[PDB]
């Protein structure tokens, strides 16, 4: 996260760290959506252009964390993966269209002050909140700058951007399964997700029922926090039918 700040304790209890076993290192962010299901970006698990293709046994998920590198004894919980599900139409060849994956845990994680699931949006909450100018919140342990790494979880609030502005900011083909967010050069304020934040949540707090909803997944961006560029996020509601199908099935 670039130009963000230290998270408060328990601020983002759905935040998950995707952890490589060997060598032990941060792979990506992710989010807790139930006691056994974790949501992330497909490209965190599968990206052939970079020879990335992780299997279940390569990975751990670490839940309830604040510190990036510390083993947070009596606070974090570490879970093994039962199965990875990548969207069958995930487009790694071109533009990361449908950049979404589910991971089922081997055992349910116990909820605590530090561990708690985020809501997934209904059609109405999505229609109400996914509007240009409305701000969401992005969290992660990724790079502090484009070109080091934070001591603790970082947080930044960023406005959703008009789709024509998103489209005009890039040569990449944007799809309805994406949205972009961030400040314009003229707005003064800044901030962005960055490498290592991928798979983490873009959340919004509903003013109707005071619950946090995950609207986006950190997906891609050209550099980090560049003037005139924006962060792109997987549109969670647009892919919710697939999410439900997987959870109903498995």
């Amino acid at each position: 996260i670039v130009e963000g700040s230290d998270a408060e304790i328990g601020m983002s209890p759905w935040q998950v760290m995707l952890f490589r076993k060997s060598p032990q290192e941060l792979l990506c962010g992710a989010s807790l959506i139930s006691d056994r299901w974790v949501l992330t970006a497909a490209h965190c698990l599968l990206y052939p252009p970079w020879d990335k293709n992780f299997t279940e046994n390569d990975l751990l998920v670490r839940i309830g964390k604040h510190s990036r590198t510390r083993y947070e004894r009596n606070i974090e919980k570490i879970s093994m993966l039962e199965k990875i599900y990548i969207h069958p139409r995930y487009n790694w060849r071109e533009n990361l269209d449908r950049d979404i994956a589910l991971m089922k845990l081997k055992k349910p994680v116990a909820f605590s002050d530090y561990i708690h699931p985020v809501c997934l949006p209904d059609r109405e909450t999505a229609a109400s909140l996914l509007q240009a100018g409305y701000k969401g919140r992005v969290t992660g342990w990724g790079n502090l700058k484009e070109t080091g790494q934070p001591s603790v979880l970082q947080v930044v609030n960023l406005p959703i951007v008009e789709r024509p502005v998103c489209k005009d900011s890039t040569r990449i083909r944007i799809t309805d399964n994406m949205f972009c967010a961030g400040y314009k050069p003229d707005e003064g304020k800044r901030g962005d997700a960055c490498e290592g934040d991928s798979g983490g949540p873009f959340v919004m707090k509903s003013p109707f029922n005071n619950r946090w909803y995950q609207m986006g997944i950190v997906s891609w961006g050209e550099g980090c926090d560049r003037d005139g560029k924006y962060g792109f996020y997987t549109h969670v509601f647009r892919l919710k039918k697939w999410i439900q199908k997987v959870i109903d099935q498995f």
């Binding site: 328990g10 605590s112 002050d113 699931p117 909140l129 100018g133 919140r137 005071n210």
Partner: peptide, 28 residues
Amino acid sequence: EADCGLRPLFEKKSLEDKTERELLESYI
């Protein structure tokens, strides 16, 4: 879950975090 999106250390205790008001103010 039925309890999703409500944080033990914030909503469940009626405490606000330091910047959630920034989000609310953006929601016209």
